[PDB]
Design a protein around this ligand. Structure first.
Ligand SMILES: *[C@@H]1O[C@H](CO)[C@@H](O)[C@H](O)[C@H]1NC(C)=O
Ligand SMILES: *[C@@H]1O[C@H](CO)[C@@H](O)[C@H](O)[C@H]1NC(C)=O
Ligand SMILES: *[C@@H]1O[C@H](CO)[C@@H](O)[C@H](O)[C@H]1NC(C)=O
Ligand SMILES: *[C@@H]1O[C@H](CO)[C@@H](O)[C@H](O)[C@H]1NC(C)=O
Ligand SMILES: *[C@@H]1O[C@H](CO)[C@@H](O)[C@H](O)[C@H]1NC(C)=O
Ligand SMILES: [Cl-]
Ligand SMILES: [Zn+2]
Lengths: 597, 194
């Protein structure tokens, strides 16, 4: 009778149709990804097309019930998710133009190549060629050549496309009554109509900026320590008061500073924990690795894996006859079918990755009873936050001793912990100014605050000011250096890596408290704590049926993103950095550059 | 003194869809209810009213054996006082139910790669079923006010949806064969004993 009762019946029909159509698609996608054949690309495309067509038809249909006349909020959440027409609010001509632009930028990125200035037939792609240079080379000029020629050969191609992408995406977003495409992206965090849990799209800007201010002193000190270490190794290339040259950061963008570890390691003769040899000594295999991770989750009160998981997952490289896509992924196919795909090696890295991916599965199993559309993380940052904390616990010396991979005669001390925290900070803290700065620039481009003729000028001013990184070669507006990173040229939002990073330390802090952990937060292992498992499970089973602010509060007692646990985690390194830096300049002047003499 | 034909109900090659649940009347025969219990091949065998061990020492005028296929997660609705799509729209047990409910996993027979769509269930109905009622209509369900004129459209859904049984589903989604035994007493002689 009423509009809500009809929407309920419509969703009732959608859920049952969607489950089966999504299941076929996932199944066809699975057979391609474990067995790369031309026939399988085809089945994968057809079943995905059916699923895409089903959604467009159901989206149109869902728009005939106005949310304005729906009071039940979970009905309202589902209808709204299905109603977001997205691109189909543009004219067909603009949609086709946009999808063509998207496609071209994507293939420019994945097929873009540079050839060395001596041999026009010997070329490198980004992956593996340029990435191997930017992660491994110590040679200043090789790194400079890779950095610059990536941005001038492929970035210049992306520039005109990116300009037209911004125009069309903004048209798309305004037609859906957002103020621009960045505001559209910030929609992931919006909560309306739940008293004491609402969250506006603009509020995300303020909380990212406020939490970032509190991160700056840790980052300034990390930056100053890293600059001093690099200056010792490159004395004629680095100013003691300047920004870090962008091509000296350990990958193609300085997205993570992970690969600076060999040049910056504090206590360079202390042994690093690597249980790989011990796994090989005890003849572990992939099966044992995943059995151990299962044991980890069972120890905190969470279910074991389903029988189908063990039967249907692909946990080792399937030999050489069939080729597989070996990037580790957790699959939620629907209908109680959960799988991990991973070409597992007998290494500590893959041992930790397995706990990470199985955390995804554990999240997927917990919200499987939610209606189809609410089967997801509470927001874009939750799934990855959940995966990360599992590797935190699994890697600690306590846990590695507990499972017999680390000798009890292993000696943890001051220095090995500072080593570990610095390696952690290079990756985790190093990416936070990078991530904030990149998204801020996109948010301002989408908002219209950066004219086209200052795109690159503003990009490099914000790199120098916010990130403390300076370009080694001047770039005019024929470049599009943002787009030389995957997420920009492939149309993915980036703030998720910032929010995820804060969430994970909030979770870990809460769970380690519930586990009664004594000592510095980075040493905590939540193993054997059913109190920790329950507190996590109370959020996991929510999916996205509740506001993310409430889902967060279930675990950590607060309703918002908070930096304090991240700083708490890094406090032992902070005080050590501050002491190390007593004879250094802390901070950076932005006018120095490698090419200005 | 002939044996009750339970093998043809339990070992049928193909079961009914639950919306069109099959009923077999059992009469004038001798039934060994403790070979059924002591098979150790059923995941569910919950009698409501008297123990199997004890009802093998009993006589009834008529026994009914209803059989059908549902999802693993739905077997719990084959019990008195349950709600859900099966209990409300397909097969409804009364409150004072006195028979037995048997079920087992039939993933090996009732699912196949690419999907077995043979089995259907009723997704919508204007109201709930009375106990032991059966509805096999295929009338388009009018969810709105505009009539349907016998075709699917906005607010007009075909009322029967198919299960899609693939062998790789989870146990909650796998097919389960179900036999329900109803025992009745009347004024006529008791033609079923053990
Ligand atoms: C891989 O795919 C081919 C065709 O796409 C199929 O015939 C073959 O059986 C598959 N291999 C395995 C191991 O399933
Ligand atoms: C919303 O709808 C679902 C199903 O229609 C129902 O179970 C739930 O209790 C309802 N909640 C509210 C607050 O209306
Ligand atoms: C998972 O744990 C339960 C609880 O003991 C057990 O009954 C079940 O058989 C286990 N599953 C597997 C695949 O071992
Ligand atoms: C968890 O408990 C078991 C049983 O007491 C023990 O063998 C294992 O080492 C424990 N793990 C930790 C990290 O305490
Ligand atoms: C069904 O078949 C099996 C296998 O032969 C048999 O043991 C069983 O008794 C049969 N069921 C009945 C009710 O006779
Ligand atoms: Cl850049
Ligand atoms: Zn992950």
């Amino acid at each position: 009778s009423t509009i809500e009762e009809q929407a309920k019946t419509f969703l009732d029909k959608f859920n049952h149709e969607a489950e089966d159509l999504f299941y076929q698609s996932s199944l066809a996608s699975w057979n391609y990804n474990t067995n790369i054949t031309e026939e399988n690309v085809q089945n994968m495309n057809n079943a995905g097309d059916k699923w895409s067509a089903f959604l467009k038809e159901q989206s149109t249909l869902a728009q005939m019930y106005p949310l304005q006349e729906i009071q039940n909020l979970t009905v309202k959440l589902q209808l709204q998710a299905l109603q977001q027409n997205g691109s189909s609010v543009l004219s067909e001509d603009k949609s086709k133009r946009l999808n063509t632009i998207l496609n071209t930028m994507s293939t420019i990125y994945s097929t873009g190549k540079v050839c060395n200035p001596d041999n026009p037939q010997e070329c490198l792609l980004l992956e593996p060629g340029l990435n191997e240079i930017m992660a491994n080379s110590l040679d200043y000029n090789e790194r400079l050549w890779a950095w610059e020629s990536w941005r001038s050969e492929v970035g210049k191609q992306l520039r005109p496309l990116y300009e037209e992408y911004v125009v069309l995406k903004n048209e798309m977003a305004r037609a859906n009554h957002y103020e621009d495409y960045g505001d559209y992206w910030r929609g992931d965090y919006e909560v309306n109509g739940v008293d004491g849990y609402d969250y506006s799209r603009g509020q995300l800007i303020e909380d990212v900026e406020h939490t970032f201010e509190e991160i700056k002193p840790l980052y300034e000190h990390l930056h100053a320590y890293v600059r001093a270490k690099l200056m010792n190794a490159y004395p004629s290339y680095i100013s003691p008061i300047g920004c870090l040259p962008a091509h000296l950061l350990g990958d193609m963008w300085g997205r993570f500073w992970t690969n600076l570890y060999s040049l910056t390691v504090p206590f360079g003769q202390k042994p690093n924990i690597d249980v790989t040899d011990a796994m090989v000594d005890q003849a572990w295999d992939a099966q044992r690795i995943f059995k151990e991770a299962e044991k980890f989750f069972v120890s905190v009160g969470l279910p074991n894996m389903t029988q189908g998981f063990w039967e249907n997952s692909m946990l080792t490289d399937p030999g050489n006859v069939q080729k597989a896509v070996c990037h580790p992924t957790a699959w939620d196919l629907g209908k109680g079918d959960f799988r991990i795909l991973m070409c597992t090696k007998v290494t500590m890295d893959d041992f930790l990755t397995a706990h990470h991916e199985m955390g995804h599965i554990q999240y997927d199993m917990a919200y499987a009873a939610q209606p189809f559309l609410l089967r997801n993380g509470a927001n874009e940052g939750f799934h990855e936050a959940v995966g990360e904390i599992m590797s935190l616990s699994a890697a600690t010396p306590k846990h590695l001793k507990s499972i017999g991979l680390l000798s009890p005669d292993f000696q943890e001390d001051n220095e090995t912990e500072i080593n570990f925290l610095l390696k952690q900070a290079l990756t985790i803290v190093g990416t936070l100014p990078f991530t904030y700065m990149l998204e801020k620039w996109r948010w301002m481009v989408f908002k219209g605050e950066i004219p086209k003729d200052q795109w690159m000028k503003k990009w490099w001013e914000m790199k120098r000011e916010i990130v403390g990184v300076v370009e080694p070669v001047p770039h005019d507006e024929t470049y599009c250096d943002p787009a030389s990173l995957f997420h920009v040229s492939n149309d993915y939002s980036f703030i998720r890596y910032y929010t995820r990073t804060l969430y994970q330390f909030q979770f870990q802090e809460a769970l380690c408290q519930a586990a009664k952990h004594e000592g510095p937060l980075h040493k905590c292992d939540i193993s054997n704590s059913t109190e920790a498992g329950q507190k996590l499970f109370n959020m996991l089973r929510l999916g996205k049926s509740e506001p993310w602010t409430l889902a967060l509060e279930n675990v950590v007692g607060a309703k918002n993103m908070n930096v304090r646990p991240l700083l708490n985690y890094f406090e032992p390194l902070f005080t050590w950095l501050k002491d190390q830096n007593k004879n250094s300049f802390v901070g950076w002047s932005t006018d120095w550059s490698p090419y200005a003499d | 003194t002939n044996l009750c034909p339970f093998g043809e109900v339990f070992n049928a090659t193909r079961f009914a869809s639950v919306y069109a649940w099959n009923r077999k009347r059992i009469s004038n025969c001798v039934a060994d209810y403790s070979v059924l219990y002591n098979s150790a091949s059923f995941s569910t065998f919950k009698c409501y009213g008297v123990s199997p061990t004890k009802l093998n020492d009993l006589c009834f005028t008529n026994v009914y054996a209803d059989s059908f296929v549902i999802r693993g997660d739905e077997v719990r609705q084959i019990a008195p006082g349950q709600t859900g799509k099966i209990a409300d729209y397909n097969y409804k047990l009364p409150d004072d139910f006195t028979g037995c409910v048997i079920a087992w996993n039939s993933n090996n027979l009732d699912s196949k790669v690419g999907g077995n769509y043979n089995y259907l269930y009723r997704l919508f109905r204007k109201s709930n079923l009375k106990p032991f009622e059966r509805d096999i209509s295929t009338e388009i369900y009018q969810a709105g006010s505009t009539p349907c004129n016998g075709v699917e459209g906005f607010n007009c859904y075909f009322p029967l949806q198919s299960y899609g049984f693939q062998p790789t589903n989870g146990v909650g989604y796998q097919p389960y064969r179900v036999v329900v035994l109803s025992f009745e007493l009347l004024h006529a002689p008791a033609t079923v004993c053990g």
